[PDB]
Amino acid sequence: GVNCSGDVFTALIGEIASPNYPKPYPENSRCEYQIRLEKGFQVVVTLRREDFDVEAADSAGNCLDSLVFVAGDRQFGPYCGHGFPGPLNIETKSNALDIIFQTDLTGQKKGWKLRYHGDPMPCPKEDTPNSVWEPAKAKYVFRDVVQITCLDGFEVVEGRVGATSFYSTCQSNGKWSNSKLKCQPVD
Ligand SMILES: [Ca+2]
Numbered sequence: 039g040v041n042c043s044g045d046v047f048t049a050l051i052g053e054i055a056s057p058n059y060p061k062p063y064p065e066n067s068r069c070e071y072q073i074r075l076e077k078g079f080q081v082v083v084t085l086r087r088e089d090f091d092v093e094a095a096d097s098a099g100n101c102l103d104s105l106v107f108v109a110g111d112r113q114f115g116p117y118c119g120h121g122f123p124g125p126l127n128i129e130t131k132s133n134a135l136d137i138i139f140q141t142d143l144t145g146q147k148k149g150w151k152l153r154y155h156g157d158p159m160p161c162p163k164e165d166t167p168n169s170v171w172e173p174a175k176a177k178y179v180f181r182d183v184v185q186i187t188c189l190d191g192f193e194v195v196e197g198r199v200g201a202t203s204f205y206s207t208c209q210s211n212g213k214w215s216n217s218k219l220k221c222q223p224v225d
Pocket of ligand 1: 093102103141142143144145146
């Protein structure tokens with residue numbers, strides 16, 4: 039095959055296709071594409087069913103040509119056959135993804151074209167005991183900032199002395215900064 043290795047993708051949106059797409063991919067391909075987003079994002083892969091045609095699996099269900107996505111410990115695929123067999127949207131749960139495409143000596147098809155985007159990872163909303171959150175949202179994600187205001191008769195301890203409100207940021211690790219700070223009754 040050709041050189042289809044070494045490319046690194048770091049933008050929050052991107053598009054990748056097998057060599058020569060939509061003309062037949064090369065035999066004996068060993069392609070690898072690396073997506074590298076900053077911590078706090080997951081790579082989400084979108085691949086339309088009809089944008090994928092790869093040599094069919096053998097009798098034993100094994101892929102001779104294959105597309106595989108590697109995200110840390112997790113693997114998606116191997117995929118082969120006529121039409122993409124996986125979900126239209128794949129949340130890999132990782133900021134780093136390796137896309138690996140290998141082909142054998144015979145039997146080539148049009149190949150594949152995929153897109154990806156970075157999806158900011160969520161920070162779960164705590165139960166707001168004696169406080170209200172601003173803004174109120176169904177989902178908070180990486181870099182969101184909220185103001186947490188204590189109800190009347192409550193205050194923040196461990197923050198400033200005598201605070202009745204504070205801010206908190208959804209961090210790259212899925213946790214709120216200032217998660218130690220709680221609204222508690224006035225003494
Ligand atoms: Ca083949």
